[PDB]
Each structure stands twice: as C-alpha cells, then as structure tokens.
Amino acid sequence: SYMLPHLHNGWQVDQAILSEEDRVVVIRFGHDWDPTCMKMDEVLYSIAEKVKNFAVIYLVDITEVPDFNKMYELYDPCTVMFFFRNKHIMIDLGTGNNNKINWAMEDKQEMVDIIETVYRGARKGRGLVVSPKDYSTKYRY
Amino acid sequence: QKEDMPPEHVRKIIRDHGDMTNRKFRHDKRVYLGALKYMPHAVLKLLENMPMPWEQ
Amino acid sequence: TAQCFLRVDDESMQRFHNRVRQILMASGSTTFTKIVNKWNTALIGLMTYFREAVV
Amino acid sequence: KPLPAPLDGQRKKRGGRRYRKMKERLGLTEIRKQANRMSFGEIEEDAYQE
Amino acid sequence: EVYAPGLDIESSLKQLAERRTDIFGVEETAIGKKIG
Amino acid sequence: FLGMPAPLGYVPGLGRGATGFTTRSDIGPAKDDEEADAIYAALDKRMDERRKERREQREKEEIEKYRMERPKIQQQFSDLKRKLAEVTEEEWLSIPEVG
RNA sequence: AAGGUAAGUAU
C-alpha cells in the first residue's frame, strides 16, 4: 500500500541518490494515486525485500518535486530511472528510450533479473547494458 | 466600439517581423506563442474563403 | 456402397491451436532451435494423425 | 531471506590438490566425454527424431 | 529497515486518500482531483 | 536520506551534476507575458464554456447512477470503521507482531 | 511517427 520511502523534497532525492555506495538507487518517478503507478509500486515493494542488499528503491512525487521533471523528461507515468553509482545507466530493452522504464513490469522475477543485470553492469563500470528480454514486443499472442 | 485600420500598418508590421531568426520580434515571447495555439483555425478560413473561378 | 468424408474435429483443431499458442508463449528466452523443433513435432504429429483430414 | 548480491566471480587464488579433489569429485568430466559436435552433412535420423 | 517508518506510511496514505478521491473523501470528484 | 531537510540556496539539478536526457525533441517544454497568458486562458475558458453546464450535469447524473450499482471501496465497510473505534486501547496495543 | 543514441576517458 505504498509504504516504500518517498522523497518529500526534491533536493532530498538528489542527496539520497548521491549518498550511494556499491548499491543501485532505483528512483521511481510518478504519482502513487495512479493505478498503473500503483501496480508498479506494488511490484517494487514485492522486489524490495528480496534484493534490499544492493537494490534500494526510493519513490518520489512529480508534483512534490517538479524540478526533475524537465531534467530527464519526466512526462509519463510509471517511469523508472536506475540512477546508480551517481551515473544514469543506459538500460536497453528493445525500446526507443533506453534510459527509462515507464510501465509496470508484468512479473516480479523479470524486474529482479533486470535490476541484478543493472547492478552487474554498474559494478563493471560500463555506462550501458542490455536486457536479456527484449520489450519491443509484448508477446501479446 | 472598434473600427478597421489601413493595410499600410499591417504591411509595416509583417515587413518588420519578416523573420524571427533575428532579435527583432523576439520580445513577443508568450504573446507571440499564444496566437500559435490557434494557427490551424485560420487555415480553415483560408480554405473556406478561397475564391471561386468567377471571383476575380 | 458408401463414402466417408472426414475432417479434423473442431475440438481437435482448437487443441492444436492452443498447443501452438503454448509453444509461441514460451518464447521469452527459449532457443530458436527449441521453438522450431517444437513446431516440427506438433506439425508432424497432426499430419501423421490425420493427413487425410488435414488435406 | 534477501537474495545474495551477485558479485563478480573470483577465480581460485591457488589451485590446490584438495581443490583439485573437489574438482575430481564434482565437475564436467562426464559431460566432456559426450561430444556435442554435429556433422555438416545430414544425419541418418529424421528431421524431428528428437 | 528498508520500509519507511509508521509516520511516513501514515502521511503517504493520507496524501493518497486526499488526492485519489475515487475511494476516499466525501465525494468522488476525479482521479487527480485536489478536492473530492 | 529520508526525513532530512533540504538546504536551500542550491539548485538540485545543477548541484548533482547531471546531463540533460534529451530523449526526443517536441516532447518537452525545453508581467506582459503573464498578462498575455491570463488573457489567452480567459479566452480558452470562454470557448470551453459553450457546453460545460450540460456536460457537467450529465456526468454528475451518470456518476450518481454508477454509485448506486457499486459504491466506493470504503463504503462497503463504513459501518465497520464506525464500529472500529470501539476496540479498547489495550487491544491493538498487544497485537501479535508475529505472523 | 517510431520500436536503429555503444559505453569509457579528460578537454
């Protein structure tokens, strides 16, 4: 029920992302009252217990912190930016915008695999990393 | 009430603001932009008021 | 004295289509060879079962 | 029970006989015997023998 | 712990109820309605 | 660092040292101006007021009809939350934390 | 329209 930590102030999120060491800071931009964003928050809550050792999730509200809306072009719901090691990582998953996941993951295990791949890429030092599962298609059929 | 104006000042205005690539009509800012919101509407009029063959 | 005109049952065709949907479903990370071999097995099974009905 | 952090793999600092004994006990010795090589020419089996 | 303290959870729930008026407030005005 | 005040006088975007994620043009925005904006907003409101009343009335009627079929989530247990406060203070105090 | 920005490194 959206009990994850939330950035009341915009600058607080900035220093929270800055205060990172050997961990990935998943800043989930959006609004809790949105239904798709509610599903994304529920998925993040489910993941949080399993991967709290290196993956920290820290939500934020666009209305509360609108200064970062124009910084990374935050104009969609469910947006996720893996701002890790003080470096905005390039997560490529077969999408045009390979630096933003703006829709709730269908399954928790997929998100866990994605976040651990992001951690591996960040620790290796590369600023870009690909996804084992391409999302160019939704596998609707 | 308001009335019409001679076309000479309209011609002077469009000649002055011929191109926005310079520092001439840059002060307009929001005022200029405001009108842009209704740019397509005028096009409708220009496709409705366009002359018929008899209209020389 | 009599002729028997036969065709795949609607239930059988639906089951085969559901099998094809299942094969296409597990394509997130499965190997291409695995997928194509599953299709080969499915098509071979259907044909070997009722070639006349397929035709 | 949080999942372990996937740290980058670190090889053995020094291959020991006891470590070799574990390698002798557990490893891919039997799998290496079965060759996965496939001839370029067609095999005698059917297309979908499996 | 990873999760926020009880006061932060209560504040977040109050904000969600105040913003999303579909299931909270006196009347259901809109999803993003400031006042229900 | 949740629960900490934000030291003012510093721009969060510039102090952190970030790079503009220019995903695509024409997707982001990138006093006389205030008066013009107010005038244009007033004109837009005047244009929109042509159908506002009837549309609002119909929407209100439809919402009222929908509420009767199925009310809000908290409505199904309004009586329960009314009787929820009847629990003693020592009751929820000794709630077993274990699951 | 697109689903086709390698990252890294100091200037």
Q: Which helix (H) or strand (E) covers residue A88, if one does?
A: strand A87-88
Q: How far is CA F89 from CA E6, E11, F50, F92, in A?
A: 18, 22, 56, 6
Give per-residue burial for A96-125: e unless 16+ CB within 10 Å, then b. ebbbbbbbbbeeeebbbbbbbbbbbbbbee
Q: Cα distance from A140 to chain F (closest Cα, Å)? A: 27
Mutation pick from E11, E13, E27 vs chain F, by most beta carbons of F within 10 Å, is E27
Rg (CA), chain D: 20
Resolution (A): 4.2
> What's A45's DSSP letter?
H
Amino acid at B38: Y
- CA separation for the pair A45, A48 (Å, rounded): 5
* Long-range contact pairs involving E23-32 (C-beta distance under 8 Å, separation at least 24): E23/F72, E23/F73, E23/F74, E24/F72, E24/F74, E28/F63, E28/F67, E28/F72, E31/A33, E31/A34, E32/A31, E32/A33
- CA separation for the pair E18, E25 (Å, rounded): 7
> Which of A51, A74, A54 is closest to A63 using CA atoms?
A74
Residue A84 near residue A20 (C-beta atoms within 8 A): yes
Q: Do A6 and E19 touch (CB under 8 A)?
A: no
Helix (H, G, I), strand (E, B) or coil at A129: strand
- CA separation for the pair A19, A68 (Å, rounded): 18
Task: Give the neighbours of chain C: at least 3 Cβ pairs within 8 Å.
Answer: A, D
> What's B44's DSSP letter?
H
Measured CA angle at F21 (ends F16, F25), to 5 deg: 145
- CA separation for the pair A17, A27 (Å, rounded): 8
Q: Do E28 and F72 touch (CB under 8 A)?
A: yes
Residue A2 near residue A38 (C-beta atoms within 8 A): yes
Residue A10 near residue A68 (C-beta atoms within 8 A): yes
Measured CA angle at A61 (ends A12, F9), to 5 deg: 35
Q: How far is CA D8 from CA A112, D5, D13, in A?
A: 17, 9, 15
Amino acid at A128: L
Measured CA angle at F81 (ends F75, F87), to 5 deg: 165
- CA separation for the pair F6, A9 (Å, rounded): 7
Neighbouring residues of D39: CB distance < 8 A, sequence distance ≥ 6: none
Residue F49 near residue B47 (C-beta atoms within 8 A): no
Joined tokens for residue D20: 């070799």
**Chain A contact for C26, CB < 8 A?**
no
Residues of chain A contacting residue F28, judged by C-beta atoms under 8 Å apart: 70, 73, 75
Helix (H, G, I), strand (E, B) or coil at C13: helix
Q: In sequence order, which ranges of chain A are alpha helices (DSSP H)?
A: 10-18, 35-50, 108-124
Domains of chain A: 2-136 (3.40.30.10)
Distance A81 CA to G6 C1' (A): 19
Which experiment gave this structure? cryo-EM
